[PDB]
Each structure stands twice: as structure tokens, then as C-alpha cells.
Amino acid sequence: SLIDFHVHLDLYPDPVAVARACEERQLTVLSVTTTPAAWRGTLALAAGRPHVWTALGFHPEVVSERAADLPWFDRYLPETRFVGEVGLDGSPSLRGTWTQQFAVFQHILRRCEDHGGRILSIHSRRAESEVLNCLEANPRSGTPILHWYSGSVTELRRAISLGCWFSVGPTMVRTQKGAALIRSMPRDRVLTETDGPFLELDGQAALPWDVKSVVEGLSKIWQIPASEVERIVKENVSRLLGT
Numbered sequence: 001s002l003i004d005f006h007v008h009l010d011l012y013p014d015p016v017a018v019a020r021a022c023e024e025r026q027l028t029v030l031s032v033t034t035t036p037a038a039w040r041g042t043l044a045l046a047a048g049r050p051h052v053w054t055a056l057g058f059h060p061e062v063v064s065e066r067a068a069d070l071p072w073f074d075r076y077l078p079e080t081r082f083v084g085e086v087g088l089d090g091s092p093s094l095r096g097t098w099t100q101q102f103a104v105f106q107h108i109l110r111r112c113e114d115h116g117g118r119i120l121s122i123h124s125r126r127a128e129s130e131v132l133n134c135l136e137a138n139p140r141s142g143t144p145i146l147h148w149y150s151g152s153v154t155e156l157r158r159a160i161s162l163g164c165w166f167s168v169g170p171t172m173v174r175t176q177k178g179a180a181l182i183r184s185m186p187r188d189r190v191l192t193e194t195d196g197p198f199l200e201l202d203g204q205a206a207l208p209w210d211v212k213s214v215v216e217g218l219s220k221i222w223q224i225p226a227s228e229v230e231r232i233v234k235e236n237v238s239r240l241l242g243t
């Protein structure tokens, strides 16, 4: 069975339909949030749905516009073992928000430490070195998963050294640079994701079950059968939960 360990169920036009479809497939999803204020509404998608695992987040792209939602993060942290989407984004269009992004992410890591550590699904686009500096400074924040890692191989080697895990998606398994990044990752720290509906495949928003294509992609890169890839990813989720 399949795992999509970073997906925005709450950003689909009909989130309940997507959640139901995941349950029908017994497809485990990490349902991430973009502001902690979204917790109650997005958590509700998981009621009666044991394959929907909801994460408490604050996405770097919305830290300015949703600044006042920050106190809901600490409020709800006791209700989940999963934090995401959180992190930093180095895109020029967000650069004026950099101080606020850093403040929020540092706050989040510190609160995670204070509550005994969490499993983190982390955004690092164009800010990989800065994300790693933050994680190195806050090692007791928990287990960091770098979602859709797109930085350098130099930075990837450092992330591995810092104990990062990786969730990899459709674009990564289908590109030269992505396949090269995957080859440097320890297989026991690789998870699969879609990042739907943000990720588009063939001009259409990805759905969680498009993660079958990531498993197929990894089968080719690792040169093992898709079933063994599925087993390894499940084993990896079990081990992750053990951390």
C-alpha cells in the first residue's frame, strides 16, 4: 500500500472527497496545514479516517499575511505528533518577509523542543543552508523531514549528516538533478509524497494516489521492484514513528 507523506488535503476543492478516496485505498497521508488557525477544520477531515494523519503548520509563504495566527501553534501542539508545513523560502518575491519567516520558524522549532520533539515536514526552497543552520541550532526539535528537497548535493550531504529524512515527489524521480539527489540519500530515510494540489502533473493538480508514480520512479532509480520500494517506505514510516 502507498504513503503520501506531504499533501494539502485542505486545499482541494472537495477535501472530504479526497480524504474518503484515500481511505478507500488505505493510502496513508500526512495532511499538512498552512496556518495553525486551520487546525480544527483540517483535523476534522481525519475523524473516522485512520489513514489521515494531520500535521500542524505555518507555511513560510503566509507568515506575514497570517502573522496573528501564531499563538494557535502552541495552543494546538499537544494534539499532534506531526508539524508541517513549516520552514523557510528564499524566493526573491518573499524576501521582504525573511525576518518574519525566520522568527516564526525559530519559534516553531523551540516550541517543538519544549513539547518533547515532533516529526517535522519542512519547506526549504532556495533556503536549504538556512534551514539546516536552524535545525543544527535546534537538534531537540525532533526529526526533520525535508520535503521536496531541491538544493545542492553539497547541502544534501550536510542534511544527511544532521539526521534529516526526505520525502520525494513526482518531479524529483523524473529529473536528472532529482534522481542524482535521490541516489545520495540513505534508502532507510526516504519517504514518498505528492504535495498535491500544488504539484501539477501534466497540467493538473496532483492527487495523493499519484504517489504510485513516485514508487515506480524509485523502483527505476534504486533498480528494485515497486513492491520492495513500497515495503521499504512502510518500514521507514514505522521507524520514523519510533523516533
Ligand SMILES: [Mn+2]
Residues within 6 Å of the ligand: 006, 008, 032, 085, 195, 198
Ligand atoms: Mn506543501
